[PDB]
Amino acid sequence: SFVEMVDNLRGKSGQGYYVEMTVGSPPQTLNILVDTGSSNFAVGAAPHPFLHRYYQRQLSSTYRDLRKGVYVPYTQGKWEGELGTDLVSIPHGPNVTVRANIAAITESDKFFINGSNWEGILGLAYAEIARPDDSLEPFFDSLVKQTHVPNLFSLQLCGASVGGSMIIGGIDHSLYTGSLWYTPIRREWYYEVIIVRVEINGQDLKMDCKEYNYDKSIVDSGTTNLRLPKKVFEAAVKSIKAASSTEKFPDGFWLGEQLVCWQAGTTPWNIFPVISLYLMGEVTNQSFRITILPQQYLRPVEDVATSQDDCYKFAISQSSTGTVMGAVIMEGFYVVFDRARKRIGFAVSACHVHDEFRTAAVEGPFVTLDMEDCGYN
Ligand SMILES: CC(C)c1cccc(CNC[C@@H](O)[C@@H]2C[C@H](C)CCCCCCCCC(=O)N(C)[C@@H](C)C(=O)N2)c1
């Protein structure tokens, strides 16, 4: 009965994807950001200028105080609060209710977004990166332990204001085309994967493949951009600049600061290259690739002035904590987080990104020797 979960995600460009949830008795409705890059379930539980609503523990007869504080520092943004448990349900999800850990956010810094429509975050990664430590059971672990929901979920994140699906407990075959290609989960903490090759417009970047995974590579729906280790970022930007050199862009555009605009419908997509990321496969010396179009890594942004042009931000930025395959990478792919089999699947999404002469793709098999050497230790 996955049809009930199709289209259960909404969001705004650059502001994440959220799902509707309820917490407590009587149920309090809240919109919750879907984040495969963290492992804490947390909701606003005190007034805040950007919160339309929040969790009111005093009104829930099933709330239980854990008498323990918590804080989570992300790559950007952080919050602190009080731990507790309560009953939680997902209206457009499985027909179950579970008692889960909940962090009641009392203070936050650059976490909530002005006018975003979500009030909390659902960390879907593993206990090893939960705060305050790995003894705080994450939501999805509680769900699997307390119900018959199979130990996997899938994400169909769609571009253009945005929507998608989080299929809890399985794979919905109407949401993708072609074959699913799987890459091993290297270690159950983040959803960590191994990138074994990078090509831009079919040209190999020719770096030590360890550089691609320094110090890790993760699949993270809570991060907007494709984030790349310093050395990889420099090579990729150098290649993307060259391919698009027939037009001049401010240096702040390549840093993700300034936006670029063009007359509505005249965006020169053809001058921006496709990026191919090769992932470690399931059998010996085998990989597969996902191909990323510029319509993914040129994120559309509301024209702050006169909505007469098409304006974009460069959605590839530099990282000092490894590669992050963020939302703009996941968009247009159907991504299966197969926890039960320790693998992540990719297929072309039913809401795939369109170009006139090019198409996003998931292609295999490829032969790749010595893939284990690509993981950083
Ligand atoms: C929580 C622990 C496990 C942790 C520490 C450091 C990195 C990571 C990796 N995942 C980060 C991710 O969980 C984290 C989640 C967000 C704060 C959730 C709220 C904002 C969502 C919409 C705007 C997204 C802008 C963006 O890209 N951000 C805001 C990056 C930069 C980021 O940080 N994202 C996890």
Give an overview of the whole structure.
This protein is mainly β. The chain has 2 domains: 17-149, Beta Barrel (Cathepsin D, subunit A, domain 1), CATH 2.40.70; 150-377, Beta Barrel (Cathepsin D, subunit A, domain 1), CATH 2.40.70. 9% of the residues lie in helices and 40% in strands. It contains 5 helices and 26 strands. The protein has helices at residues 139-146, 209-212, 230-243, 294-297, 327-330; strands spanning 9-11, 17-23, 28-35, 41-44, 64-73, 78-89, 97-109, 120-123, 153-157, 162-168, 176-184, 192-193, 195-200, 203-204, 217-219, 226-229, 260-263, 275-280, 286-292, 298-300, 309-314, 316-319, 323-325, 333-338, 343-349, 361-367. A 6-stranded mixed β-barrel has the order 2-3-8-4-7-6. Strands 12-15-23-16-22 form a 5-stranded mixed beta sheet. It has a 5-stranded antiparallel beta sheet with strand order 14-13-18-19-26. A hairpin with a 5-residue loop joins β18 (275-280) and β19 (286-292). The protein binds the ligand CC(C)c1cccc(CNC[C@@H](O)[C@@H]2C[C@H](C)CCCCCCCCC(=O)N(C)[C@@H](C)C(=O)N2)c1. The ligand CC(C)c1cccc(CNC[C@@H](O)[C@@H]2C[C@H](C)CCCCCCCCC(=O)N(C)[C@@H](C)C(=O)N2)c1 binds next to β3. The ligand CC(C)c1cccc(CNC[C@@H](O)[C@@H]2C[C@H](C)CCCCCCCCC(=O)N(C)[C@@H](C)C(=O)N2)c1 is lined by residues 15-16, 33, 35, 37-38, 72, 74-77, 111, 121, 129, 220, 222-225. Its EC number is 3.4.23.46. It is a single-pass type I membrane protein. The modification N6-acetyllysine is found at residues 68, 206, 210, 216, 230-231, 238. It is found in: Cell membrane; Golgi apparatus, trans-Golgi network; Endoplasmic reticulum; Endosome.
